[PDB]
Every structure is written in C-alpha cells, then in structure tokens.
Design an enzyme around this catalytic site. Sequence first.
Site, PDB file in Angstrom:
ATOM      1  CB  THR A 106      -0.821   0.128   1.044  1.00  0.00           C
ATOM      2  OG1 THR A 106      -1.335  -0.937   1.163  1.00  0.00           O
ATOM      3  CG2 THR A 106      -1.924   0.912   0.850  1.00  0.00           C
ATOM      4  CB  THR A 107       3.909   2.392   2.483  1.00  0.00           C
ATOM      5  OG1 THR A 107       3.440   2.319   3.074  1.00  0.00           O
ATOM      6  CG2 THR A 107       4.063   3.723   2.192  1.00  0.00           C
TER       7      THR A 107
ATOM      8  CE1 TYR B  50     -16.739  -0.502  -3.889  1.00  0.00           C
ATOM      9  CE2 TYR B  50     -16.679  -1.982  -6.203  1.00  0.00           C
ATOM     10  CZ  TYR B  50     -16.953  -0.539  -5.292  1.00  0.00           C
ATOM     11  OH  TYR B  50     -18.539  -0.291  -6.041  1.00  0.00           O
TER      12      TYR B  50
ATOM     13  CE1 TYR C 242      -2.632  -3.824   6.424  1.00  0.00           C
ATOM     14  CE2 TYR C 242      -1.432  -4.072   3.795  1.00  0.00           C
ATOM     15  CZ  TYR C 242      -1.256  -3.338   5.054  1.00  0.00           C
ATOM     16  OH  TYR C 242      -1.529  -1.356   4.829  1.00  0.00           O
TER      17      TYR C 242
ATOM     18  NE  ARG D  25      -4.136   2.414   3.721  1.00  0.00           N
ATOM     19  CZ  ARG D  25      -4.560   2.982   3.036  1.00  0.00           C
ATOM     20  NH1 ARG D  25      -4.360   3.505   1.698  1.00  0.00           N
ATOM     21  NH2 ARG D  25      -3.240   4.097   3.220  1.00  0.00           N
TER      22      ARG D  25
ATOM     23  CE  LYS E 170       0.675  -3.395   7.054  1.00  0.00           C
ATOM     24  NZ  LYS E 170       0.992  -2.807   6.301  1.00  0.00           N
TER      25      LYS E 170
ATOM     26  CB  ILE F 127       4.520  -4.505   8.077  1.00  0.00           C
ATOM     27  CG1 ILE F 127       5.178  -5.837   8.093  1.00  0.00           C
ATOM     28  CG2 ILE F 127       4.974  -3.841   6.510  1.00  0.00           C
ATOM     29  CD1 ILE F 127       4.081  -6.857   7.206  1.00  0.00           C
TER      30      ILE F 127
END
Lengths: 291, 291
Positions: free
Chosen positions: A44-45, A107, A133, A138, A161, A203
């Site tokens: 994501t980052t 989603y 994760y 989100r 995570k 993480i």
Amino acid sequence: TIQGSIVAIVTPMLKDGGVDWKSLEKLVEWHIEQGTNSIVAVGTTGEASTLSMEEHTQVIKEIIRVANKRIPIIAGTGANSTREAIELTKAAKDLGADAALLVTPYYNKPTQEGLYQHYKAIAEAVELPLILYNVPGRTGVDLSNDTAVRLAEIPNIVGIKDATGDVPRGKALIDALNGKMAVYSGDDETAWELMLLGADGNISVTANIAPKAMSEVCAVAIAKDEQQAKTLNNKIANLHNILFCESNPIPVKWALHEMGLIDTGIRLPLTPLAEQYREPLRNALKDAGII
Amino acid sequence: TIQGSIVAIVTPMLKDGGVDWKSLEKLVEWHIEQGTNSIVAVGTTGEASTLSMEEHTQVIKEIIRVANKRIPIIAGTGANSTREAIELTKAAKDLGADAALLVTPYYNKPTQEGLYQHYKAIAEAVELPLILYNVPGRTGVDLSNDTAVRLAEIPNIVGIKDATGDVPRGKALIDALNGKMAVYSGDDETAWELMLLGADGNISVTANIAPKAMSEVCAVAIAKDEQQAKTLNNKIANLHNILFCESNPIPVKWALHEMGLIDTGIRLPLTPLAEQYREPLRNALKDAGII
C-alpha cells in the site's frame, strides 16, 4: 521467521509519475545500511494500486537485485480477485521474493468463509510464505481473529499484519495463535506495544524516514525490554502520527522529498501532500532530528 | 436525463465461473419487457472486481447488443487508478455506452481534492456522460456533498449515485445542486424516499428480482405520489433487507438462482449464499410473490 523493522517502502516517482529507478536503488541501499531488517515491495505504501502489472514486477525485480540477498524481501501481491492474487503471488515467487504480503480483498466485502477460501486457494496454488494483512478501515472488511487462527493452520500462511491498532485484540490474537504463525503490527503508533506483547515485528511506514531508530525500537521490544522500548519509541512517536495527516503514503512521500531522497511524483487519485501540512511536517522532521 | 428504475445487473455465471452469456441475454430481455428503464453493466453487483478487462468489455458489448437501443446502457468503469478509470471509460464510450458509472477510488483513500482531480481528469479525457458513485462502507472514503457539488460544474459529470442511505444528507445534496446534475439512490431501502425528494432514479439491486415492481415504485415516486410510493415500496420492503444478509451480490445471485433465471456461479473471494440463509430467502421471495 522474518523479524524486526520491516519497511513498507514507497515507490519513488519522477514529477510526471514515472518510476524513479535510481532513487529507489538509493533507498534500498540506505535501508540496508541503516539496519532495516526487511522490505515490503509494492504494498500500500508503495502505491500498488496505481502501478501497472509490468511496473509491479519491475519494482520487485529491482529491489531484489539491489538488496542482493542481504535482507529478506516481501512482495505485495494482494488483489480483490482470487485469480489475480494467485497471478501476482506466482510472479513474486518466480522473481525470487522471500514471502508475499496479501491485503484482504477490498471493496467487494467477502464473507469470513470467503476470506478463508481466498487465502486457502492462494496458499495451495503457490508454494511461497504468505503473510495476511488486515486493515478494515481501507478494505471494508475485517478478517476476524477466529478466521486468522483457522488460516494459521494452512501450510504456507506464516503470519498476519494486524493494522487495527487495537492492542487488546492483537494480544488476544497472539495468545490464541500460541506461536502457530507470526503477528506483525501494521500500526506504527502501537507497534512497540504489540511487539512487547509478542509480535515478531512492525511492517512500518515510519521506518521509511527513520529506519535506524525504528530498527532499534523493534529490537528492544522483541527483547521484551519495556523501559527501552518505550524510551526509544517516544523519540519518534510524533512521527507515527504526522505521517497520517492525509492518507498514507501522501505524507511519507513528501517527508522523503523534504529529506532530499525522492522527487514529488505520486499518482492520481493520490495527490502531493496538501500545502497546509508541509510546514508542520517539516517541523516534525527537524524535531526528530531527521532533517 | 436517464431516469427511473436502473438495475445494477448481476453478471450470470456458469458453475465454473465463466460468464453465462445465454442467461445474460435472457435477463436483459426480461428487464426490458418488465419495465426496467436502464441497465448498469458490470458494476459492483455485476462483479466488476473479478471480471477481466476483456470480460468487462464483452459484458458491456453483449448488453448493448441485446438492448438494441431500447433503453440506455450505463457501463461501470470505476477503478482506484485514474489511468485505469480513463482507459475503461474510453472503452465504454467506444462500445457505444450511453454513460459510465464510476465508484470513488477504493482502498487507497484519496483526499477530497484527489477525488476531484480524479473525476476531472476522466471527464476531460473522455467525452461521455459520467455518474459518480459514493459508497463509503465499501471504499474507505466518503465523497462529500461539497465535493459532489464542485464536480457537478465539470462538463460531462452528469450525476451521482448516493449509496449512503442517509436521506437528510441526500436531500441536502439535491437542494444544493438545484438541478446542475442528477442524484440517484444507491440504497434500495430508502430509494423511494429519495426519489420523492427529487432523485432521478434508483440504481437498484432489488430491481434484479422485482424489475416490474421497482419500475412502478420509481415511476410513482418520480411523479411525487407519496402514498403510492409508500404502498408499493412496502410490498417489497423486506426484499431490500434480505438481499444484504451477506455482501451484495451474494444474496441477489442466489435469489435469481432460486427463481431459475441464472446458475450458481460467483467468483472468489465471493461465495454462494451460505446454506443457512437459503430457506429464509426463499420464504422472502414467496412472501413477495416472486416465486
């Protein structure tokens, strides 16, 4: 097995959004030199959402090439389609990734059993260590502790995570697993706590700008030294907060830009950090001794 | 302009998951003869997430073909990448779609300004009517009324599907827009109310199984006949709740299977409706006169 500070590396970009290859190389080298224990590529980052299939692969290939087996590399391979996650995860295995990190499908909100079947199918399709994760805020879905404990029974699922930032819940997960699989914090603000309670690492997003300090925090927390963990984390604690004034990775990419490490590129729909947040961010970096 | 009952059509699938083209054609013809005013092809309910680029294009193509210009066709072309949204939207335009429906980028959480730049870039890149779609619970982001009002000023942005189910908020949006762009309900439970308050239609899930009934509800609500809208909606009100016992489109696809219209195919991470919910759903369908 993988332990310590695990940076969720950003994907440096040129002003026009093209991947900034040289800057990515320097970052990888800097992380290894600074004590970072592992890197998560294209998570994501790292703006996995806006990189093409080819770029996803190029970036993984480049980080692996530059790391040169010095630290394990984890490839972000999540997707909200089971078919696609299998494809990405295989690509990752083929490129030599040490493990893959897979966010829960977002989603489309699968049921708990759907999440179980999703990860089971990937684990059975690709012989590669997989890290789950969970970041409900989100994705629109929450992988429960119960489901995580069931998945821990599957061969190849070696960890999760936990980005909830809910420590009681995290401790409960760790206790219920009793070593069956690893737990990593996905929340910098509370990472030190979760590691003191049994998590194998963090993480991190903060590790992007303070890799040495976060490396030290993880080390002493894993060692169960509560006094040191708390003392060292306090030094970078405001960073854990300011790096989320706007959705990650917007602030962290700007922070690295202020540090002179990357240019301003970031792909729509994400946008460069809004002007009103820049001075406060610069102050925070000066205060933490980063710039 | 596009008004009335607009069904967010499911994408019928064979047991192995392949697209069931024969069932799709029948479904489209059935909607046209039953009163449905428009079809949203490959939206959320149509499992956009698990269909490939080509299947996406083909489903839109087939729906446009079978409709034979009898009702307008809206193509779901949302993506959490602006570049991808542009490519998908351009493809829909080229296929002859009448408009495109674009959910807000999910998972990566863009800022309000990022949402603004996202949609503006798409509107300027493709000459096609565009309908915004807000459903926070699934995306991790909420396109504010304020941002929606700004976007209505952009050429080619002609409407917004509001799935908040927050009637006062929806009414506030309709009043602020003063006709600049259309507002469509994205919440079957409250749709009848929003249309009585000025919404141009309902991009519905329930319309999948009760197309004639929903077309009537939309007609009388658009006509501002409050008692008729209440009475007619009351008959299918329980369907609006039951179709979400598990994440949409899981229940509605099972509902259509019980009705003998489609097979059981649905793609991971989604799963067929859990066994325990099937008798309850069958009873709801019987109560409503559908089977």
